[PDB]
Amino acid sequence: SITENTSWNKEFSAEAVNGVFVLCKSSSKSCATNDLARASKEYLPASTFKIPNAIIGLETGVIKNEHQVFKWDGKPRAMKQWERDLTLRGAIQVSAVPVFQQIAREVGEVRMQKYLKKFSYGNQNISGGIDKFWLEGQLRISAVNQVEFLESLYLNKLSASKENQLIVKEALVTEAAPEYLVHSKTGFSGVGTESNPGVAWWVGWVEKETEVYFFAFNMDIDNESKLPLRKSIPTKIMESEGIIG
Amino acid sequence: MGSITENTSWNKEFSAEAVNGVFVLCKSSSKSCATNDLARASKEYLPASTFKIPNAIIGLETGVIKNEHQVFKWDGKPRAMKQWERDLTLRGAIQVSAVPVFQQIAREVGEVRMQKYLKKFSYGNQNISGGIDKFWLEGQLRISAVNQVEFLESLYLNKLSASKENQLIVKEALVTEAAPEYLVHSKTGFSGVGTESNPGVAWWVGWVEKETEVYFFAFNMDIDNESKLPLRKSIPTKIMESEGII
Ligand code: NA
């Protein structure tokens, strides 16, 4: 059950953002959102796909262990931040595409399809190129599906060892306070094309006292200058709900 | 673990605050440690709350703790700190240093199993005399800063005599700072203000993951007044900041 919450519209209006926030307390049984329709609309996952990709890499042994170092071969990569040896956490934090492209190639299309089916990950469409289906392909997932997937990860209920789920969760910690703990991941497909904007994401969960909140945000984006809104709008809302800050 | 050297240059941060203490910092790649005081780095002190690291692992290994989602229910009876009068997750109990929670865990573990695991973990002087629910607070258990970084390195590598899953559970509970460049796991300790000419001890121990490097650290200091407690984090933080780790 998904319920609409008009109070959050102001945080989108202020910035002229077309997007959706989904927030679920305790579980995905009851989620609130500003837009029922968009909450379930499916978009390219972009970098949010690093989460299942890392779990699958570990499950298949492609990622040998949580202390795996992904070495840089010295060839040019799109960002200087990617031109170095990286740990799993490091590659997730700087969204090092080529590391995850190689993981996906070594996983291969058969195993990748199997695990996305097991994870109920979006439309599970990996066709068109095994190293780019989540970047420019036909794979799509909704904000509602992201919170279901993240809840499963939080509960160690995905079709993967508890160890591997714990390894990926540690790699996703983005804020640690005495009061609460934030696991999150951003994504950005790009600026899109004429009359067809890209998508920007922020998904994760907040552990606070004995409660947990799952969240997923996405928005239309046609200019990189708008990227900070993918964190600030959901942060504003969760602040106004008394969850963080 | 492989070598240790004395670094006089860190004494600056201790003298500035009139602190008698030690910092041990070890770089995992080079298997090399540095400290401001080799003698104090080997002196053994009550672990106090730093003992919540082994105690939680042992609690999980023995099944006394079910998993990271176990909620430690408050029975409603008063507690010294007001922060303890609520339900707590494992991370919550570790983060607020909830003494009664871990006293009950130690009782359920029992002396025989507690002794066995501290032997397996090579944890300090392995003396748990003094009562099963207070040996680490006011009994005879002592551990040095060098021993602390040896133990934390084992945990980081999942090389303690415990399941990898249980070591991972305790590690996630120990995360205290997450930045895009680095991740900090840490734990504080404080035994009390001590007695005339016999101060208590305050601790800060943990590790830092940065780029492909790992830094293990252990800090302790004499403390005779609660107002000095913030120095157990500020002195090591300033040292690690000056080393470029932050
Ligand atoms: Na590249």
Residue numbers in the entry:
A (entry chain A): 21 to 265
B (entry chain B): 19 to 264
Please quote the authors directly.
pmcβ-Lactamases are a major mechanism of resistance to the clinically vital β-lactam antibiotics, with >2,000 different β-lactamases reported (1). Oxidation of penams to their sulfone state promotes bifurcation of their reaction with SBLs at the acyl–enzyme stage to give transiently inactivating species that are more resistant to hydrolysis than the nascent AEC 2, turning penam sulfones into transient inactivators of SBLs. Studies on the mechanism of the new SBLi enmetazobactam employing mass spectrometry and X-ray crystallography inform on its mode of action and also lead to reevaluation of mechanisms of current clinically important SBLi.
Samples of OXA-10, treated with tazobactam or tazobactam in combination with BME (with full conversion to the respective −18- and +60-Da species verified by SPE-MS) were crystallized. Evidence for cross-linking was observed in both OXA-10 chains. In chain A, clear and continuous electron density for both the Lal cross-link 10 and some unreacted carbamylated lysine was observed. The quality of the electron density map was overall less clear in chain B, though the mFo-DFc polder OMIT map indicates partial cross-linking. By contrast, with the D(2S)-stereochemistry observed on BME addition to Dha 9, the new chiral center formed by reaction of Lys70 with Dha 9 has, at least predominantly, the L(2S)-stereochemistry. The combined SPE-MS (including derivatization trials with BME), LC-MS/MS, and crystallographic results imply initial formation of a Dha residue 9, which reacts with Nε-amine of a Lys side chain to give the cross-linked Lal species 10. To date Lal 10 has rarely been identified in natural protein structures under biological conditions, with the spirochaete flagella hook protein being a notable example, and it has not previously been described with a β-lactamase. From the inhibition perspective, the Dha 9 and Lal cross-linked 10 species (which cannot be directly distinguished by intact protein MS) are of particular interest as they are the only modifications we observed leading to apparently irreversible inactivation of both class A and D SBLs.
